[PDB]
């Protein structure tokens, strides 16, 4: 059913060991795809800030007017601590803004799940050919899916106490 | 009646496809069942504020020098009720629920016609008597159903939400 | 007219057999007799609960040096008003009965012409305004009419009713 | 807008005459002098009822140290109030009065386009928001035209009213 | 929709020439956008007359230990909100704001499917709920746009009205 799609390639190919659609059910699969891109896209930004934040990179000056800085807040889940009450609720907010108004399908326009131009910003989609399109596609499926491991592995051994990072 | 509870932002919205399946009649069931899970969790959070903002009555709930200032806000105020007074609601919102005022059947449509007075209008408005007040009226409990689980995974840690207003408002 | 009145779970229920002559002009009158002792047992039992609340007013009643606090709850406080007291309900609730406002002619479909304000009207609703609401008036009639005789019987036997809840509820 | 007003037990009562002159003309402007007479007395009344009832005001009312509590009960109150007070009834009253948001300037049928709860318009009873609340109103105001002159002269003995109650209330 | 707003005194016054321009498409976007500054200026006004009566809430607001009396009368008020309490106002007014349910955007005749008392959509008469009270409430946007360019100006040298008022009220 689903054995042509993105995603399925070498060396696994199509690769569903609990066959959760193997029943061929297309909005299944689009909620899936869906929801394995939108983890994708996160994983991707998260070990990047991990991995830039341990080595110490902070923004500069403060985080708010009572003098807290961004160079006292450490890296890792020890950041919720220091990080303001305030600030810990727009963190919260703004991104579900993001969830509500900004990032998804606002117009019913997007070719797939996922695309969430609108018709506002794209960099030139159409410039790519098919062959591209499905290529790229294919990149932020699977660099997507490599960082879900990846952040998962950062998270368990902050808490494991057994560092994976020099 | 199909076209209700599916206006924007999520539409029709069966994610799971429960209601995959054709029929009214398991359309009928979960759609009372939630409107009742709509009607139950709305009282209940307003039962919350109105409890945990120091509303009470004055006076003895019983002869045991219980007053309803000695029963706290929260989950032990349902259990620490006395037994007998217990019986008497399962005895009165009993026959509320089954048999007086409020006809349970196999959820019926449940019109239950009563609503206010010049409020119901078909014949006057047939986009606000139904699809717009019917609507929200789920979503409301669709809040309030989202209130409970909050209300309850909340106040399971120490305090609970006049008690969790003056300590820690933070995660675990 | 008929088609009206009675209703789920009763229907028309005259089961001794005292109406089934087959002529509304009997049952015409029977009416409104029930109508009447329906708005007057209605207020009485709202009467009898906000008097036993200790809702009273501040001040003297006459220039005998009663308060309003004086006058006992339950039966005892209409019979000892003062009888020139007794005489001025007598003289505006007598002309308020029998010509002015409220005209009872004769028992006549009393319709009054005080028929809410916007609310509970023709022109409007079909179902609620005559066939519920007409009929909930006369069933809440029905309930306070039975809740004197109660009332009464409560307050025969033992003191007062707020002394008829301090002590035993049980029966004699 | 011709039958108002006088109803059971007088119907049209006009027992002296000057107004069974056969043309309406005149008994066109009568008829809303009455109206505005009628507005008049029944605000008059009931800020006569709760002037004398002790519900004032806190605070002093100008520069001059009156309070609300300090300016007498009954026909005094009016008359001693400052004088630059008055003048701003005048500026306020006189420009909603004989220019607009009343304008009563023409005198019949202004209608003023403002109704209670805004209830009784038209598109409802058509029998009850004409010919029976436009009467009740006008014999409204007939009932407070009359408490009026009385209580000018129940004044005139030389007290306010709530010490003419206090004191004897027989006749001289 | 032309027909809307202006009336007597002044009819359709536009005096010094923007709107005459022959289009309506214009004058479309100018009558929603005087709406909702309309809408706002007065709840503005009636907040600051509601804050400035002295009547406040009890408790602290926050963690700052700042009460609902600390925080001043008048511009300083909103000002000195701490900044977390501006972010949620911003978070839920934003949410409410642009779409959600007043939906705003576009930007003409919105309609927002509420009404005042359930009172009045249509179905009742056509003359007040469309061209005289819908008339009203962009005209009461009108008096209450002018009373904060006042109250701005009222508090720009002066203090607060509060201390407006008890010192001197004539111009500069
Ligand atoms: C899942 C992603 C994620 C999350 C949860 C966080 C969370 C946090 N970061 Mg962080 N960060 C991230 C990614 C992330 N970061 C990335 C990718 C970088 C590299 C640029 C950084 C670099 C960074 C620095 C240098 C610092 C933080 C800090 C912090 C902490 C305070 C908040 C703050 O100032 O953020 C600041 C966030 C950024 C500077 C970058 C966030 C960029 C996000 C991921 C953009 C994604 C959404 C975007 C709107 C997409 C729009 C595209 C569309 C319009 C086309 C907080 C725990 C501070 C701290 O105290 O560290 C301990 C601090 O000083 N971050
Ligand atoms: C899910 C519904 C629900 C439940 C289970 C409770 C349960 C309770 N309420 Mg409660 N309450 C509710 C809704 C509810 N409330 C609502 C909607 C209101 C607002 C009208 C109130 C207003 C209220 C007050 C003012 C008080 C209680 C109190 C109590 C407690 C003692 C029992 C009692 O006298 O009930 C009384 C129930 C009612 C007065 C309202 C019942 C409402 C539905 C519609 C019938 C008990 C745990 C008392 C208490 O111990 O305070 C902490 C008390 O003083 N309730
Ligand atoms: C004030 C007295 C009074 C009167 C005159 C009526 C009159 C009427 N009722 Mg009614 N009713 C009353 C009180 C009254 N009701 C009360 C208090 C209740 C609550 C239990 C009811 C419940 C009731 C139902 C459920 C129904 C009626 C119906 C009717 C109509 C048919 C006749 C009937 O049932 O017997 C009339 C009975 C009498 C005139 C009784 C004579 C007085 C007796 C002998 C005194 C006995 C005292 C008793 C022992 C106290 C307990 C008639 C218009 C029927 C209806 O509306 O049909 C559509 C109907 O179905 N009634
Ligand atoms: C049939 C019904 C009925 C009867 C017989 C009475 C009779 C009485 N009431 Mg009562 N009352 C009634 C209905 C009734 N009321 C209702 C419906 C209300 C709620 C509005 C009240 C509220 C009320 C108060 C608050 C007080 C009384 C009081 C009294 C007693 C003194 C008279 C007086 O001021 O009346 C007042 C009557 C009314 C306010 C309503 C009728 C007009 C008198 C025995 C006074 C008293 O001393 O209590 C014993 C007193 O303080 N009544
Ligand atoms: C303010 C002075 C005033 C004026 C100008 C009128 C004018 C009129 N009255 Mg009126 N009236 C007044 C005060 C006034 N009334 C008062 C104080 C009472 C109370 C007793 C009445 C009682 C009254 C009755 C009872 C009737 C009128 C009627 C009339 C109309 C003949 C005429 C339009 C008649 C009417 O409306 O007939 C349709 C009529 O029958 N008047
Ligand atoms: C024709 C009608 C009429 C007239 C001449 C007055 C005149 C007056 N009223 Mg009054 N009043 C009226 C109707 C009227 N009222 C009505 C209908 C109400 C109920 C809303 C009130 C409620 C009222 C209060 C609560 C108070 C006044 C007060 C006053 C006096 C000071 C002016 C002021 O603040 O107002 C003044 C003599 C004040 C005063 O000192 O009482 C004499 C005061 O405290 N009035
Ligand atoms: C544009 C309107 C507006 C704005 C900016 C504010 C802003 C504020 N109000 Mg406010 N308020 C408003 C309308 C507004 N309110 C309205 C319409 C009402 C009546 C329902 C109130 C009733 C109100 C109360 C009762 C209180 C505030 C308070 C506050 C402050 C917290 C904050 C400055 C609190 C405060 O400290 O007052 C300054 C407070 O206790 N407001
Ligand atoms: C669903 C709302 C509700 C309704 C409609 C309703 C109707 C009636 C009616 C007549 C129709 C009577 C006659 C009656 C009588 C008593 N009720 Mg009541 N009642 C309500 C519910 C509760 C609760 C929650 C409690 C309670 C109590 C008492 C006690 C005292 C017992 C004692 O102290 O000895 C007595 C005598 C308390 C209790 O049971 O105490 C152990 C207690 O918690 N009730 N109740
Ligand atoms: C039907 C409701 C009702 C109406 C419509 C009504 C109208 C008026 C009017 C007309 C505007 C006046 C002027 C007036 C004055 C007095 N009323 Mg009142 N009155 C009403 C009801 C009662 C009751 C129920 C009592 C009562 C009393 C008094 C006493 C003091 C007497 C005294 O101290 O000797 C005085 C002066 C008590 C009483 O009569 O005591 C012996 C008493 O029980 N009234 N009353
Ligand atoms: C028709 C109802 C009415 C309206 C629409 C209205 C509007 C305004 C406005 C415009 C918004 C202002 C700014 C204002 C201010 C003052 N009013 Mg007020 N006012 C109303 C009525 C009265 C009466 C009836 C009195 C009165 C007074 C005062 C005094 C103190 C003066 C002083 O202490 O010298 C001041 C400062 C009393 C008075 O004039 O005392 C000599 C007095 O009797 N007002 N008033
Ligand atoms: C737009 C109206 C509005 C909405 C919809 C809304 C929703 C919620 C919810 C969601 C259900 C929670 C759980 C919540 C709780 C708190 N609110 Mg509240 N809130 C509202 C408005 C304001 C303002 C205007 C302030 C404020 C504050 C606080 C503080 C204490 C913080 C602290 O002491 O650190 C806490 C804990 C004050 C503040 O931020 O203080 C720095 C302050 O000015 N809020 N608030």
Do not use: C
């Amino acid at each position: 059913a689903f054995e042509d799609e993105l995603g399925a390639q070498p060396p696994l190919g199509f690769f569903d060991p609990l066959g959760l659609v193997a029943d061929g059910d297309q909005e299944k699969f689009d909620r899936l795809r869906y929801v394995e891109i939108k983890h994708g896209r996160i994983s991707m930004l998260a070990v990047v800030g991990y991995l830039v934040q341990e080595a110490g990179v902070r923004l500069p000056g403060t985080i708010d007017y009572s003098g807290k800085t961004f160079a006292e807040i450490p890296n890792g889940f020890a950041a919720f601590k220091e990080i303001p009450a305030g600030g810990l609720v727009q963190l919260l907010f703004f991104i579900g803004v993001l969830e509500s108004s900004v990032m998804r399908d606002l117009t019913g326009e997007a070719e797939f799940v996922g695309d969430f131009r609108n018709g506002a910003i794209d960099f030139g989609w159409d410039t790519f050919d098919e062959e591209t399109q499905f290529k790229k596609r294919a990149i932020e499926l699977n660099q997507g899916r490599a960082a879900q491991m990846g952040i998962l592995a950062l998270m368990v051994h902050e808490q494991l106490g057994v560092s994976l990072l020099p | 009646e199909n076209e209700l509870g599916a206006q924007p932002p999520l539409g029709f919205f069966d994610p799971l496809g429960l209601v995959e399946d054709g029929n009214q009649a398991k359309f009928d069931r979960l759609r009372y069942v939630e409107l009742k899970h709509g009607r139950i969790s709305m009282l209940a959070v307003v039962g919350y504020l109105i409890e945990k903002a120091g509303i009470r009555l004055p006076g003895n709930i019983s002869y045991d020098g219980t007053t309803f200032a000695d029963i706290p806000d929260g989950f032990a105020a349902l259990s620490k009720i006395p037994d007998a007074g217990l019986f008497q609601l399962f005895a009165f919102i009993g026959f509320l629920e089954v048999f007086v005022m409020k006809d349970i059947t196999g959820g019926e449509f449940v019109g239950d016609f009563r609503n206010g007075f010049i409020d119901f209008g078909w014949d006057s408005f047939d986009e606000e008597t139904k699809l717009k007040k019917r609507a929200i009226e789920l979503n409301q409990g669709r809040a309030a159903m989202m209130g409970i689980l909050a209300l309850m995974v909340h106040e399971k840690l120490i305090p609970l939400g006049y008690d969790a207003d003056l300590p820690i408002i933070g995660h675990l």
